[PDB]
Amino acid sequence: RTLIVTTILEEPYVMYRKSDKPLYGNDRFEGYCLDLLKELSNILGFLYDVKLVPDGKYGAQNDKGEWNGMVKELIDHRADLAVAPLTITYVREKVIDFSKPFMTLGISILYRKGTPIDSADDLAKQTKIEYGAVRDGSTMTFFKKSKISTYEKMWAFMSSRQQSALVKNSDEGIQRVLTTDYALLMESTSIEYVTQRNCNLTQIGGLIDSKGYGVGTPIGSPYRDKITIAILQLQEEGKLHMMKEKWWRG
Amino acid sequence: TLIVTTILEEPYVMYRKSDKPLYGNDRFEGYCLDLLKELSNILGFLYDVKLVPDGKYGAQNGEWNGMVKELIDHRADLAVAPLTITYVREKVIDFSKPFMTLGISILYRKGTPIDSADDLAKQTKIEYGAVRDGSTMTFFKKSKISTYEKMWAFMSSRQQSALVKNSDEGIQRVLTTDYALLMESTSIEYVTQRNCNLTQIGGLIDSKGYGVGTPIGSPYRDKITIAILQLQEEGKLHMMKEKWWRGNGCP
Numbered sequence: 001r002t003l004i005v006t007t008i009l010e011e012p013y014v015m016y017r018k019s020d021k022p023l024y025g026n027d028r029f030e031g032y033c034l035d036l037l038k039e040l041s042n043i044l045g046f047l048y049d050v051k052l053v054p055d056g057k058y059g060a061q062n063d064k065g066e067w068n069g070m071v072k073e074l075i076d077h078r079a080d081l082a083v084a085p086l087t088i089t090y091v092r093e094k095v096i097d098f099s100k101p102f103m104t105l106g107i108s109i110l111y112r113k114g115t116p117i118d119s120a121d122d123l124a125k126q127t128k129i130e131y132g133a134v135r136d137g138s139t140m141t142f143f144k145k146s147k148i149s150t151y152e153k154m155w156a157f158m159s160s161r162q163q164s165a166l167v168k169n170s171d172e173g174i175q176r177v178l179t180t181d182y183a184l185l186m187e188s189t190s191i192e193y194v195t196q197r198n199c200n201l202t203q204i205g206g207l208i209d210s211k212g213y214g215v216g217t218p219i220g221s222p223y224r225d226k227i228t229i230a231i232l233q234l235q236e237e238g239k240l241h242m243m244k245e246k247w248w249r250g
Numbered sequence: 251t252l253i254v255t256t257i258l259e260e261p262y263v264m265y266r267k268s269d270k271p272l273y274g275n276d277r278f279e280g281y282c283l284d285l286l287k288e289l290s291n292i293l294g295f296l297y298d299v300k301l302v303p304d305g306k307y308g309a310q311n312g313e314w315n316g317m318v319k320e321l322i323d324h325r326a327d328l329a330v331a332p333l334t335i336t337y338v339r340e341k342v343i344d345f346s347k348p349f350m351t352l353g354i355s356i357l358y359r360k361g362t363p364i365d366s367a368d369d370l371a372k373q374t375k376i377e378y379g380a381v382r383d384g385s386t387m388t389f390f391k392k393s394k395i396s397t398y399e400k401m402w403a404f405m406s407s408r409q410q411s412a413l414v415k416n417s418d419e420g421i422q423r424v425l426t427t428d429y430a431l432l433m434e435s436t437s438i439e440y441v442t443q444r445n446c447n448l449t450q451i452g453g454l455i456d457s458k459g460y461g462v463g464t465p466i467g468s469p470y471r472d473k474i475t476i477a478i479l480q481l482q483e484e485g486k487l488h489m490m491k492e493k494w495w496r497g498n499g500c501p
Protein backbone atom coordinates (compact mmCIF):
# COMPACT_ATOMS: atom_id res chain seq x y z
CA ARG A 1 0.00 0.00 0.00
CA THR A 2 1.16 3.53 -0.87
CA LEU A 3 1.79 5.48 2.38
CA ILE A 4 0.16 8.87 3.04
CA VAL A 5 2.77 11.40 4.14
CA THR A 6 1.36 14.57 5.67
CA THR A 7 3.60 17.62 5.58
CA ILE A 8 3.47 21.39 5.50
CA LEU A 9 5.04 24.13 3.35
CA GLU A 10 8.07 25.55 5.21
CA GLU A 11 11.42 26.69 3.77
CA PRO A 12 13.62 24.91 3.13
CA TYR A 13 12.03 21.68 4.36
CA VAL A 14 9.11 21.61 1.93
CA MET A 15 8.69 24.04 -0.95
CA TYR A 16 6.71 24.35 -4.17
CA ARG A 17 8.92 23.53 -7.13
CA LYS A 18 8.87 26.43 -9.57
CA SER A 19 7.83 25.27 -13.06
CA ASP A 20 6.63 26.86 -16.32
CA LYS A 21 3.96 24.13 -16.38
CA PRO A 22 1.49 22.82 -13.74
CA LEU A 23 2.90 20.09 -11.46
CA TYR A 24 1.19 16.95 -10.12
CA GLY A 25 1.70 14.65 -7.13
CA ASN A 26 5.04 14.46 -5.36
CA ASP A 27 6.71 16.33 -8.26
CA ARG A 28 5.02 19.50 -6.90
CA PHE A 29 7.51 19.59 -4.03
CA GLU A 30 11.21 19.77 -3.25
CA GLY A 31 13.21 20.41 -0.10
CA TYR A 32 15.17 18.77 2.69
CA CYS A 33 12.16 16.71 3.74
CA LEU A 34 11.58 15.49 0.20
CA ASP A 35 15.19 14.30 0.01
CA LEU A 36 14.77 12.73 3.48
CA LEU A 37 11.61 10.93 2.39
CA LYS A 38 13.49 9.59 -0.67
CA GLU A 39 16.39 8.29 1.45
CA LEU A 40 13.86 6.74 3.83
CA SER A 41 11.86 5.02 1.08
CA ASN A 42 15.03 3.68 -0.54
CA ILE A 43 16.10 2.03 2.71
CA LEU A 44 12.67 0.77 3.80
CA GLY A 45 11.09 0.14 0.38
CA PHE A 46 7.75 1.96 0.75
CA LEU A 47 5.87 4.03 -1.84
CA TYR A 48 4.41 7.35 -0.70
CA ASP A 49 2.07 10.19 -1.64
CA VAL A 50 3.02 13.57 -0.21
CA LYS A 51 -0.01 15.56 0.93
CA LEU A 52 -0.13 19.02 2.55
CA VAL A 53 -1.90 19.05 5.94
CA PRO A 54 -5.37 20.39 5.10
CA ASP A 55 -5.65 22.92 7.99
CA GLY A 56 -2.11 24.13 7.35
CA LYS A 57 -1.01 23.65 10.98
CA TYR A 58 1.68 21.71 12.84
CA GLY A 59 -0.26 20.42 15.83
CA ALA A 60 -1.43 22.13 19.03
CA GLN A 61 -4.22 21.79 21.63
CA ASN A 62 -7.02 24.34 22.02
CA ASP A 63 -8.79 25.21 25.29
CA LYS A 64 -10.80 21.98 25.12
CA GLY A 65 -7.58 19.98 24.72
CA GLU A 66 -8.54 19.17 21.11
CA TRP A 67 -5.67 18.62 18.65
CA ASN A 68 -5.17 20.07 15.14
CA GLY A 69 -2.62 19.98 12.31
CA MET A 70 -0.38 17.10 11.26
CA VAL A 71 -0.53 15.73 14.81
CA LYS A 72 -4.34 15.41 14.61
CA GLU A 73 -4.05 13.82 11.16
CA LEU A 74 -1.80 11.11 12.62
CA ILE A 75 -4.00 10.58 15.70
CA ASP A 76 -7.02 10.11 13.42
CA HIS A 77 -5.12 7.78 11.06
CA ARG A 78 -5.60 10.09 8.07
CA ALA A 79 -1.85 9.93 7.42
CA ASP A 80 0.79 7.19 7.88
CA LEU A 81 3.72 9.55 8.51
CA ALA A 82 4.34 13.22 9.09
CA VAL A 83 7.57 14.45 7.53
CA ALA A 84 8.20 18.08 8.39
CA PRO A 85 10.10 20.25 10.86
CA LEU A 86 7.75 18.91 13.52
CA THR A 87 9.33 19.50 16.91
CA ILE A 88 9.51 16.62 19.38
CA THR A 89 7.68 17.71 22.52
CA TYR A 90 6.17 16.29 25.70
CA VAL A 91 2.57 17.06 24.75
CA ARG A 92 2.96 15.68 21.21
CA GLU A 93 4.89 12.52 22.16
CA LYS A 94 1.99 11.56 24.42
CA VAL A 95 -0.48 11.39 21.50
CA ILE A 96 1.66 10.23 18.58
CA ASP A 97 4.81 8.05 18.21
CA PHE A 98 7.82 10.13 17.07
CA SER A 99 10.81 8.48 15.39
CA LYS A 100 14.16 9.55 16.81
CA PRO A 101 15.26 13.03 15.57
CA PHE A 102 16.71 13.45 12.06
CA MET A 103 17.81 17.03 12.85
CA THR A 104 18.85 18.65 16.15
CA LEU A 105 17.90 22.23 17.04
CA GLY A 106 17.37 24.61 19.95
CA ILE A 107 15.44 27.75 20.72
CA SER A 108 17.53 30.81 19.91
CA ILE A 109 17.10 34.48 18.97
CA LEU A 110 16.82 35.92 15.46
CA TYR A 111 17.74 39.62 15.52
CA ARG A 112 19.53 42.23 13.42
CA LYS A 113 23.32 42.63 13.47
CA GLY A 114 25.14 45.41 15.28
CA THR A 115 23.09 45.36 18.46
CA PRO A 116 24.52 44.97 21.98
CA ILE A 117 21.95 42.28 22.92
CA ASP A 118 23.84 39.03 23.55
CA SER A 119 21.43 36.68 25.35
CA ALA A 120 17.84 35.87 26.31
CA ASP A 121 18.55 37.54 29.65
CA ASP A 122 19.40 40.83 27.92
CA LEU A 123 15.95 40.71 26.28
CA ALA A 124 14.22 39.64 29.49
CA LYS A 125 15.45 42.55 31.60
CA GLN A 126 14.14 45.28 29.24
CA THR A 127 10.95 46.49 27.53
CA LYS A 128 12.16 48.67 24.62
CA ILE A 129 13.01 45.81 22.26
CA GLU A 130 9.92 43.70 21.53
CA TYR A 131 10.28 39.94 21.26
CA GLY A 132 8.03 36.97 20.73
CA ALA A 133 7.48 33.74 18.85
CA VAL A 134 5.17 32.00 16.36
CA ARG A 135 1.81 31.62 18.09
CA ASP A 136 1.01 28.04 19.28
CA GLY A 137 4.32 26.73 17.92
CA SER A 138 6.45 24.65 20.25
CA THR A 139 8.72 27.64 20.99
CA MET A 140 5.81 29.65 22.42
CA THR A 141 4.62 26.65 24.43
CA PHE A 142 8.10 26.25 25.93
CA PHE A 143 7.99 29.77 27.32
CA LYS A 144 4.36 29.39 28.38
CA LYS A 145 5.10 26.23 30.36
CA SER A 146 8.49 27.19 31.80
CA LYS A 147 8.93 27.88 35.52
CA ILE A 148 12.48 29.19 35.01
CA SER A 149 12.60 32.80 36.28
CA THR A 150 13.91 34.48 33.09
CA TYR A 151 11.58 32.50 30.81
CA GLU A 152 8.50 33.22 32.95
CA LYS A 153 9.30 36.92 32.67
CA MET A 154 9.67 36.55 28.91
CA TRP A 155 6.38 34.66 28.70
CA ALA A 156 4.67 37.43 30.68
CA PHE A 157 5.93 40.01 28.16
CA MET A 158 5.07 37.82 25.17
CA SER A 159 1.55 37.13 26.35
CA SER A 160 0.92 40.76 27.36
CA ARG A 161 -1.52 42.97 25.39
CA GLN A 162 -3.35 39.98 23.84
CA GLN A 163 -0.15 38.37 22.57
CA SER A 164 0.71 41.24 20.17
CA ALA A 165 4.41 40.27 20.38
CA LEU A 166 3.55 36.96 18.73
CA VAL A 167 3.46 36.24 14.96
CA LYS A 168 1.28 33.83 12.93
CA ASN A 169 4.20 32.25 11.04
CA SER A 170 7.99 32.39 10.62
CA ASP A 171 7.92 34.49 7.46
CA GLU A 172 5.91 37.15 9.33
CA GLY A 173 8.40 37.09 12.22
CA ILE A 174 11.29 37.53 9.78
CA GLN A 175 9.68 40.61 8.20
CA ARG A 176 8.98 42.02 11.67
CA VAL A 177 12.65 41.58 12.67
CA LEU A 178 13.86 43.20 9.42
CA THR A 179 11.50 46.19 9.63
CA THR A 180 11.03 47.03 13.31
CA ASP A 181 12.88 46.70 16.61
CA TYR A 182 11.91 43.09 17.24
CA ALA A 183 13.70 39.88 18.15
CA LEU A 184 12.10 36.57 17.17
CA LEU A 185 12.46 33.54 19.42
CA MET A 186 13.04 30.96 16.70
CA GLU A 187 14.45 27.43 16.25
CA SER A 188 18.19 27.48 15.57
CA THR A 189 17.93 25.52 12.32
CA SER A 190 15.58 28.12 10.84
CA ILE A 191 17.81 30.94 12.12
CA GLU A 192 20.76 29.43 10.25
CA TYR A 193 18.73 29.23 7.03
CA VAL A 194 17.58 32.84 7.35
CA THR A 195 20.96 34.32 8.28
CA GLN A 196 22.56 32.64 5.26
CA ARG A 197 20.11 34.69 3.15
CA ASN A 198 19.67 37.88 5.21
CA CYS A 199 23.16 39.20 5.86
CA ASN A 200 21.86 41.98 8.14
CA LEU A 201 20.44 39.36 10.51
CA THR A 202 22.21 37.16 13.06
CA GLN A 203 21.63 34.60 15.77
CA ILE A 204 21.84 36.16 19.26
CA GLY A 205 23.30 33.96 22.02
CA GLY A 206 23.33 30.16 22.15
CA LEU A 207 20.72 27.41 22.14
CA ILE A 208 18.19 26.84 24.91
CA ASP A 209 15.99 23.71 25.34
CA SER A 210 17.80 21.52 22.78
CA LYS A 211 15.48 19.16 20.92
CA GLY A 212 14.91 17.69 17.50
CA TYR A 213 12.56 17.17 14.59
CA GLY A 214 11.24 13.65 14.26
CA VAL A 215 9.03 11.80 11.80
CA GLY A 216 5.56 11.52 13.30
CA THR A 217 3.59 8.25 13.21
CA PRO A 218 0.28 7.32 14.83
CA ILE A 219 0.69 5.49 18.17
CA GLY A 220 1.42 1.80 17.52
CA SER A 221 2.89 2.37 14.07
CA PRO A 222 5.10 -0.47 12.79
CA TYR A 223 6.92 2.17 10.73
CA ARG A 224 8.14 4.19 13.71
CA ASP A 225 11.08 2.02 14.78
CA LYS A 226 12.06 1.18 11.19
CA ILE A 227 12.29 4.89 10.31
CA THR A 228 14.29 5.45 13.49
CA ILE A 229 16.73 2.78 12.36
CA ALA A 230 16.95 4.24 8.83
CA ILE A 231 17.62 7.69 10.32
CA LEU A 232 20.52 6.34 12.40
CA GLN A 233 21.95 4.71 9.28
CA LEU A 234 21.74 7.96 7.32
CA GLN A 235 23.27 9.84 10.25
CA GLU A 236 26.21 7.45 10.73
CA GLU A 237 26.91 7.48 6.98
CA GLY A 238 27.12 11.29 6.92
CA LYS A 239 24.14 11.74 4.57
CA LEU A 240 21.95 13.80 6.91
CA HIS A 241 24.80 16.27 7.31
CA MET A 242 25.20 16.45 3.54
CA MET A 243 21.44 16.91 3.10
CA LYS A 244 21.30 19.84 5.48
CA GLU A 245 24.36 21.43 3.82
CA LYS A 246 22.61 21.17 0.44
CA TRP A 247 19.49 23.11 1.45
CA TRP A 248 21.04 25.46 4.02
CA ARG A 249 24.05 26.89 2.20
CA GLY A 250 23.40 30.32 0.69
CA THR B 251 10.76 -3.13 41.26
CA LEU B 252 12.81 -2.52 38.09
CA ILE B 253 16.32 -3.88 37.60
CA VAL B 254 18.54 -1.14 36.20
CA THR B 255 21.79 -2.15 34.54
CA THR B 256 24.55 0.44 34.54
CA ILE B 257 28.32 0.84 34.49
CA LEU B 258 30.85 2.87 36.51
CA GLU B 259 31.74 5.93 34.43
CA GLU B 260 32.50 9.45 35.75
CA PRO B 261 30.50 11.40 36.37
CA TYR B 262 27.47 9.36 35.25
CA VAL B 263 27.72 6.60 37.84
CA MET B 264 30.39 6.59 40.55
CA TYR B 265 31.00 4.86 43.87
CA ARG B 266 29.83 7.29 46.55
CA LYS B 267 32.45 8.20 49.18
CA SER B 268 31.91 7.02 52.77
CA ASP B 269 33.96 5.77 55.73
CA LYS B 270 31.56 2.86 56.05
CA PRO B 271 30.99 0.03 53.57
CA LEU B 272 28.01 0.85 51.32
CA TYR B 273 25.12 -1.35 50.15
CA GLY B 274 22.45 -1.31 47.41
CA ASN B 275 21.64 1.88 45.46
CA ASP B 276 23.36 3.90 48.19
CA ARG B 277 26.64 2.57 46.73
CA PHE B 278 26.31 4.96 43.80
CA GLU B 279 25.99 8.62 42.94
CA GLY B 280 26.24 10.62 39.73
CA TYR B 281 24.29 12.19 36.90
CA CYS B 282 22.59 8.90 36.02
CA LEU B 283 21.48 8.23 39.59
CA ASP B 284 19.96 11.73 39.71
CA LEU B 285 18.26 10.98 36.37
CA LEU B 286 17.03 7.62 37.61
CA LYS B 287 15.64 9.33 40.69
CA GLU B 288 13.81 11.92 38.52
CA LEU B 289 12.40 9.30 36.13
CA SER B 290 11.18 7.21 39.09
CA ASN B 291 9.42 10.25 40.60
CA ILE B 292 7.50 11.01 37.41
CA LEU B 293 6.71 7.37 36.58
CA GLY B 294 6.30 5.81 40.03
CA PHE B 295 8.61 2.81 39.86
CA LEU B 296 11.04 1.33 42.39
CA TYR B 297 14.53 0.51 41.11
CA ASP B 298 17.46 -1.80 41.83
CA VAL B 299 20.79 -0.63 40.40
CA LYS B 300 23.12 -3.41 39.26
CA LEU B 301 26.54 -3.01 37.64
CA VAL B 302 26.70 -4.91 34.34
CA PRO B 303 28.53 -8.13 35.24
CA ASP B 304 30.99 -8.00 32.27
CA GLY B 305 31.69 -4.26 32.65
CA LYS B 306 30.97 -3.59 28.95
CA TYR B 307 28.59 -1.18 27.19
CA GLY B 308 27.43 -3.34 24.30
CA ALA B 309 29.14 -4.50 21.14
CA GLN B 310 28.64 -7.36 18.69
CA ASN B 311 31.26 -10.02 17.84
CA GLY B 312 27.32 -11.80 15.84
CA GLU B 313 26.37 -12.05 19.52
CA TRP B 314 26.09 -9.15 21.99
CA ASN B 315 27.69 -8.36 25.36
CA GLY B 316 27.46 -5.68 28.03
CA MET B 317 24.37 -3.70 29.02
CA VAL B 318 22.79 -4.37 25.64
CA LYS B 319 22.98 -8.15 26.25
CA GLU B 320 21.44 -7.75 29.73
CA LEU B 321 18.41 -6.10 28.10
CA ILE B 322 18.18 -8.70 25.31
CA ASP B 323 18.24 -11.49 27.91
CA HIS B 324 15.71 -9.70 30.18
CA ARG B 325 18.12 -9.59 33.14
CA ALA B 326 17.51 -5.84 33.33
CA ASP B 327 14.49 -3.66 32.58
CA LEU B 328 16.44 -0.45 31.92
CA ALA B 329 19.97 0.53 31.07
CA VAL B 330 20.82 3.96 32.50
CA ALA B 331 24.29 4.96 31.42
CA PRO B 332 26.06 7.05 28.79
CA LEU B 333 25.02 4.39 26.30
CA THR B 334 25.36 5.89 22.85
CA ILE B 335 22.34 5.51 20.59
CA THR B 336 23.57 3.73 17.46
CA TYR B 337 22.26 1.95 14.40
CA VAL B 338 23.57 -1.49 15.44
CA ARG B 339 22.29 -1.10 19.00
CA GLU B 340 18.86 0.32 18.09
CA LYS B 341 18.20 -2.75 15.99
CA VAL B 342 18.45 -5.01 19.09
CA ILE B 343 17.05 -2.82 21.88
CA ASP B 344 14.38 -0.10 22.21
CA PHE B 345 16.19 3.13 23.08
CA SER B 346 14.32 5.95 24.79
CA LYS B 347 14.78 9.32 23.11
CA PRO B 348 18.07 10.94 24.15
CA PHE B 349 18.44 12.60 27.57
CA MET B 350 21.81 14.06 26.57
CA THR B 351 23.14 15.19 23.24
CA LEU B 352 26.77 15.05 22.09
CA GLY B 353 29.23 14.29 19.29
CA ILE B 354 32.66 12.87 18.60
CA SER B 355 35.50 15.35 19.19
CA ILE B 356 39.23 15.34 19.99
CA LEU B 357 40.88 15.35 23.41
CA TYR B 358 44.44 16.71 23.33
CA ARG B 359 47.16 18.50 25.28
CA LYS B 360 47.37 22.29 24.97
CA GLY B 361 49.97 24.37 23.14
CA THR B 362 49.67 22.82 19.68
CA PRO B 363 48.65 24.16 16.23
CA ILE B 364 46.33 21.14 15.75
CA ASP B 365 42.83 22.50 15.05
CA SER B 366 40.74 19.65 13.60
CA ALA B 367 40.32 15.99 12.67
CA ASP B 368 41.60 16.75 9.18
CA ASP B 369 44.89 17.91 10.72
CA LEU B 370 45.34 14.51 12.45
CA ALA B 371 44.32 12.62 9.30
CA LYS B 372 47.04 14.02 7.00
CA GLN B 373 49.94 13.12 9.31
CA THR B 374 51.37 10.14 11.18
CA LYS B 375 53.62 11.83 13.76
CA ILE B 376 50.81 12.44 16.26
CA GLU B 377 49.21 9.11 17.20
CA TYR B 378 45.44 9.12 17.69
CA GLY B 379 42.77 6.56 18.51
CA ALA B 380 39.71 5.66 20.54
CA VAL B 381 38.27 3.26 23.10
CA ARG B 382 38.26 -0.19 21.47
CA ASP B 383 34.79 -1.55 20.52
CA GLY B 384 33.22 1.73 21.64
CA SER B 385 30.70 3.49 19.46
CA THR B 386 33.28 6.12 18.47
CA MET B 387 35.68 3.46 17.19
CA THR B 388 32.80 1.81 15.33
CA PHE B 389 31.84 5.13 13.70
CA PHE B 390 35.29 5.44 12.15
CA LYS B 391 35.28 1.73 11.30
CA LYS B 392 31.98 1.89 9.35
CA SER B 393 32.45 5.34 7.77
CA LYS B 394 32.83 5.70 3.99
CA ILE B 395 33.94 9.32 4.41
CA SER B 396 37.44 9.73 2.99
CA THR B 397 38.94 11.60 5.96
CA TYR B 398 37.42 9.16 8.45
CA GLU B 399 38.40 6.12 6.36
CA LYS B 400 41.98 7.35 6.51
CA MET B 401 41.80 7.88 10.28
CA TRP B 402 40.32 4.40 10.71
CA ALA B 403 43.14 2.95 8.60
CA PHE B 404 45.66 4.49 11.01
CA MET B 405 43.80 3.59 14.23
CA SER B 406 43.35 -0.06 13.24
CA SER B 407 46.90 -0.63 11.95
CA ARG B 408 49.73 -2.34 13.85
CA GLN B 409 47.27 -4.65 15.65
CA GLN B 410 45.29 -1.60 16.84
CA SER B 411 48.07 -0.17 19.07
CA ALA B 412 46.60 3.34 18.69
CA LEU B 413 43.41 2.22 20.46
CA VAL B 414 42.92 2.17 24.28
CA LYS B 415 40.83 -0.10 26.55
CA ASN B 416 39.00 2.67 28.41
CA SER B 417 38.68 6.46 28.63
CA ASP B 418 40.93 6.74 31.68
CA GLU B 419 43.74 4.95 29.77
CA GLY B 420 43.15 7.32 26.86
CA ILE B 421 43.44 10.41 29.08
CA GLN B 422 46.74 9.34 30.69
CA ARG B 423 48.06 8.48 27.23
CA VAL B 424 47.12 11.99 26.06
CA LEU B 425 48.83 13.50 29.12
CA THR B 426 52.06 11.52 28.71
CA THR B 427 52.65 11.11 24.99
CA ASP B 428 52.02 12.78 21.64
CA TYR B 429 48.57 11.21 21.47
CA ALA B 430 45.13 12.55 20.65
CA LEU B 431 41.99 10.73 21.82
CA LEU B 432 38.82 10.56 19.77
CA MET B 433 36.27 11.02 22.53
CA GLU B 434 32.59 11.86 23.06
CA SER B 435 32.29 15.61 23.57
CA THR B 436 30.42 15.40 26.91
CA SER B 437 33.31 13.42 28.37
CA ILE B 438 35.81 15.93 26.95
CA GLU B 439 33.90 18.82 28.58
CA TYR B 440 33.97 16.94 31.89
CA VAL B 441 37.70 16.22 31.90
CA THR B 442 38.81 19.59 30.48
CA GLN B 443 37.05 21.34 33.38
CA ARG B 444 39.08 19.22 35.81
CA ASN B 445 42.51 18.99 34.14
CA CYS B 446 43.63 22.35 32.76
CA ASN B 447 46.42 20.77 30.72
CA LEU B 448 43.82 19.20 28.42
CA THR B 449 41.61 20.76 25.77
CA GLN B 450 39.13 19.93 23.03
CA ILE B 451 40.40 20.23 19.46
CA GLY B 452 37.93 21.47 16.84
CA GLY B 453 34.16 20.99 16.82
CA LEU B 454 31.75 18.04 17.04
CA ILE B 455 31.41 15.38 14.36
CA ASP B 456 28.48 12.92 14.15
CA SER B 457 25.78 14.42 16.41
CA LYS B 458 24.32 11.68 18.57
CA GLY B 459 22.84 11.17 22.01
CA TYR B 460 22.68 8.91 25.06
CA GLY B 461 19.40 7.06 25.58
CA VAL B 462 17.87 4.80 28.20
CA GLY B 463 18.00 1.26 26.88
CA THR B 464 15.03 -1.09 27.18
CA PRO B 465 14.49 -4.49 25.60
CA ILE B 466 12.54 -4.56 22.36
CA GLY B 467 8.80 -4.31 23.04
CA SER B 468 9.18 -2.74 26.49
CA PRO B 469 6.15 -0.75 27.76
CA TYR B 470 8.59 1.48 29.66
CA ARG B 471 10.46 2.89 26.65
CA ASP B 472 7.77 5.38 25.63
CA LYS B 473 6.95 6.27 29.26
CA ILE B 474 10.61 7.05 29.80
CA THR B 475 10.85 9.09 26.59
CA ILE B 476 7.85 11.15 27.77
CA ALA B 477 9.42 11.61 31.22
CA ILE B 478 12.70 12.72 29.56
CA LEU B 479 10.94 15.33 27.39
CA GLN B 480 9.22 16.80 30.48
CA LEU B 481 12.57 16.99 32.30
CA GLN B 482 14.15 18.70 29.29
CA GLU B 483 11.30 21.19 28.88
CA GLU B 484 11.43 22.01 32.59
CA GLY B 485 15.16 22.77 32.45
CA LYS B 486 16.03 19.91 34.82
CA LEU B 487 18.29 17.94 32.48
CA HIS B 488 20.23 21.15 31.96
CA MET B 489 20.50 21.71 35.70
CA MET B 490 21.54 18.09 36.25
CA LYS B 491 24.37 18.37 33.71
CA GLU B 492 25.67 21.65 35.16
CA LYS B 493 25.69 20.03 38.60
CA TRP B 494 27.91 17.09 37.69
CA TRP B 495 30.08 18.84 35.07
CA ARG B 496 31.20 21.98 36.97
CA GLY B 497 34.29 20.45 38.55
CA ASN B 498 37.28 22.50 39.65
CA GLY B 499 37.12 24.97 36.76
CA CYS B 500 39.54 25.62 33.90
CA PRO B 501 40.07 28.71 31.69
Ligand SMILES: O=S1(=O)NCN(C2CC2)c2ccc(O)cc21
Pocket residue numbers: 088089101103104105210211212213347348349350351459478479482487
Ligand atom coordinates in the same frame (compact mmCIF):
# COMPACT_ATOMS: atom_id res chain seq x y z
O1 LIG C 1 13.57 15.67 22.16
S1 LIG C 1 14.72 14.74 22.18
O2 LIG C 1 14.68 13.40 21.53
N1 LIG C 1 15.17 14.46 23.79
C1 LIG C 1 15.52 15.71 24.44
N2 LIG C 1 16.83 16.11 23.92
C2 LIG C 1 17.72 16.76 24.86
C3 LIG C 1 19.02 16.08 25.23
C4 LIG C 1 17.89 16.13 26.23
C5 LIG C 1 17.10 16.14 22.53
C6 LIG C 1 18.27 16.76 21.98
C7 LIG C 1 18.52 16.77 20.59
C8 LIG C 1 17.58 16.16 19.70
O3 LIG C 1 17.78 16.16 18.34
C9 LIG C 1 16.41 15.56 20.21
C10 LIG C 1 16.19 15.56 21.60
Ligand SMILES: O=S1(=O)NCN(C2CC2)c2ccc(O)cc21
Pocket residue numbers: 100101102103104231232235240335336347348350351352457458459460
Ligand atom coordinates in the same frame (compact mmCIF):
# COMPACT_ATOMS: atom_id res chain seq x y z
O1 LIG D 1 20.59 9.25 17.67
S1 LIG D 1 19.52 10.27 17.59
O2 LIG D 1 18.22 10.12 18.30
N1 LIG D 1 19.14 10.53 15.95
C1 LIG D 1 20.30 11.03 15.21
N2 LIG D 1 20.52 12.42 15.62
C2 LIG D 1 21.07 13.32 14.61
C3 LIG D 1 20.23 14.48 14.12
C4 LIG D 1 20.51 13.31 13.20
C5 LIG D 1 20.64 12.76 17.00
C6 LIG D 1 21.18 14.02 17.43
C7 LIG D 1 21.29 14.33 18.81
C8 LIG D 1 20.86 13.39 19.79
O3 LIG D 1 20.94 13.66 21.13
C9 LIG D 1 20.32 12.15 19.40
C10 LIG D 1 20.22 11.85 18.02
Ligand SMILES: C=C(C)[C@H]1CN[C@H](C(=O)O)[C@H]1CC(=O)O
Pocket residue numbers: 010058085086087133134136137138139140169170185186187
Ligand atom coordinates in the same frame (compact mmCIF):
# COMPACT_ATOMS: atom_id res chain seq x y z
C1 LIG E 1 7.47 26.89 11.66
C2 LIG E 1 6.75 26.44 12.71
C3 LIG E 1 5.48 27.16 13.16
C4 LIG E 1 7.10 25.22 13.55
C5 LIG E 1 8.30 24.35 13.13
N1 LIG E 1 8.77 23.68 14.39
C6 LIG E 1 7.92 24.18 15.56
C7 LIG E 1 6.79 23.15 15.93
O1 LIG E 1 6.90 22.03 15.32
O2 LIG E 1 5.89 23.49 16.77
C8 LIG E 1 7.44 25.55 15.03
C9 LIG E 1 8.55 26.62 15.18
C10 LIG E 1 8.59 27.29 16.55
O3 LIG E 1 7.63 27.01 17.32
O4 LIG E 1 9.57 28.07 16.78
Ligand SMILES: C=C(C)[C@H]1CN[C@H](C(=O)O)[C@H]1CC(=O)O
Pocket residue numbers: 259307308332333334380381383384385386387416417432433434
Ligand atom coordinates in the same frame (compact mmCIF):
# COMPACT_ATOMS: atom_id res chain seq x y z
C1 LIG F 1 32.89 5.35 27.89
C2 LIG F 1 32.56 4.40 26.99
C3 LIG F 1 33.41 3.15 26.81
C4 LIG F 1 31.33 4.51 26.10
C5 LIG F 1 30.43 5.72 26.40
N1 LIG F 1 29.54 5.83 25.20
C6 LIG F 1 30.17 5.03 24.06
C7 LIG F 1 29.29 3.75 23.80
O1 LIG F 1 28.18 3.78 24.43
O2 LIG F 1 29.75 2.84 23.05
C8 LIG F 1 31.59 4.70 24.59
C9 LIG F 1 32.59 5.85 24.35
C10 LIG F 1 33.17 5.99 22.95
O3 LIG F 1 32.97 5.06 22.13
O4 LIG F 1 33.82 7.06 22.74
Ligand SMILES: [Cl-]
Pocket residue numbers: 098099100228345346347475
Ligand atom coordinates in the same frame (compact mmCIF):
# COMPACT_ATOMS: atom_id res chain seq x y z
CL1 LIG G 1 12.18 6.77 20.02
